[PDB]
Amino acid sequence: GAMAPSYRVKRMDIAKNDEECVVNAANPRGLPGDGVCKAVYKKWPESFKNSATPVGTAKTVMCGTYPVIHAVGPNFSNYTESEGDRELAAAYREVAKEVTRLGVNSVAIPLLSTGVYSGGKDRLTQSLNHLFTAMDSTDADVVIYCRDKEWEKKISEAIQMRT
């Protein structure tokens, strides 16, 4: 584990992370997709062999010795608010299990279901709070990747508030 497990946020491409593994905001079919998923496909295309997995789950595939954890958040266009919230919490609990199993000291993670899968809502707080619920009991350094300067400020404030 990390000597003093921490949360950090960076505003940059998760495909250029400095962590021991990456979480893909995957689709259930293992397709190249859009946004984070397309950047991950360009960087680690070998990780998409048999990566298909249902909503609410995470499946790890190695690119060389570098683990790619394919985590499938719900598309809120399709799910009810209630069912979508349950599957979003579940996807992050499966990420915590995979990070633990791999024995990594650090992980790069995007906010699941906040892009094309957001159903056109701002889900920063909802997604981040489920990320914390899952990852708080792990001892990996977590580095959250976002693209919007105002999201960076809001995520940074939420981390600092817990101290």
In the complex, the smallest distance separating the C-beta of residue 55 from Cl ion, rounded to whole angstroms, is 12
- How does DSSP classify residue 21? -
Residues that bind Cl ion (rule: CB under 5 A) add up to a total of: 8
- Residue 148 engages Cl ion in binding (rule: CB under 5 A): yes
* Cα–Cα distance measured from residue 74 to residue 55, given in angstroms and rounded to the nearest whole number: 6
Closer to Cl ion by Cβ: residue 8 or 147: 147
In the complex, the smallest distance separating the C-beta of residue 63 from Cl ion, rounded to whole angstroms, is 19
Binding site listing for ADP-D-ribose: 13, 27, 35, 115-117
- State the Rg of the chain over Cα: 14
Residue of the chain from 19, 74, 151, 158 that contacts Cl ion (CB under 5 A): 151
Closer to Cl ion by Cβ: residue 75 or 100: 75
Q: Considering only 6-14, 50-58, 59-67, 91-99, which stretch makes contact with Cl ion by CB under 5 A?
A: 6-14
* Cα–Cα distance measured from residue 74 to residue 90, given in angstroms and rounded to the nearest whole number: 10
**CA nearest to 65, candidates 22, 1, 14:** 22
Q: Considering only 9-17, 41-49, 62-70, 95-103, which stretch makes contact with Cl ion by CB under 5 A?
A: 9-17
What are the CA-CA distances from residue 96 to residues 52, 101, 116, 135 (Å)? 19, 9, 23, 6
The residue written with tokens 């992050």 in the block is 92
- Residue 152 engages Cl ion in binding (rule: CB under 5 A): no
Taking a C-beta distance cutoff of 8 angstroms, is the pair 20, 155 a contact?
A: no
Residue of the chain from 5, 8, 10, 12 that contacts Cl ion (CB under 5 A): 12
Taking a C-beta distance cutoff of 8 angstroms, is the pair 74, 96 a contact?
A: no
Q: Considering only 4-12, 55-63, 80-88, 98-106, which stretch makes contact with Cl ion by CB under 5 A?
A: 4-12
Residue of the chain from 5, 8, 10, 13 that contacts Cl ion (CB under 5 A): 13
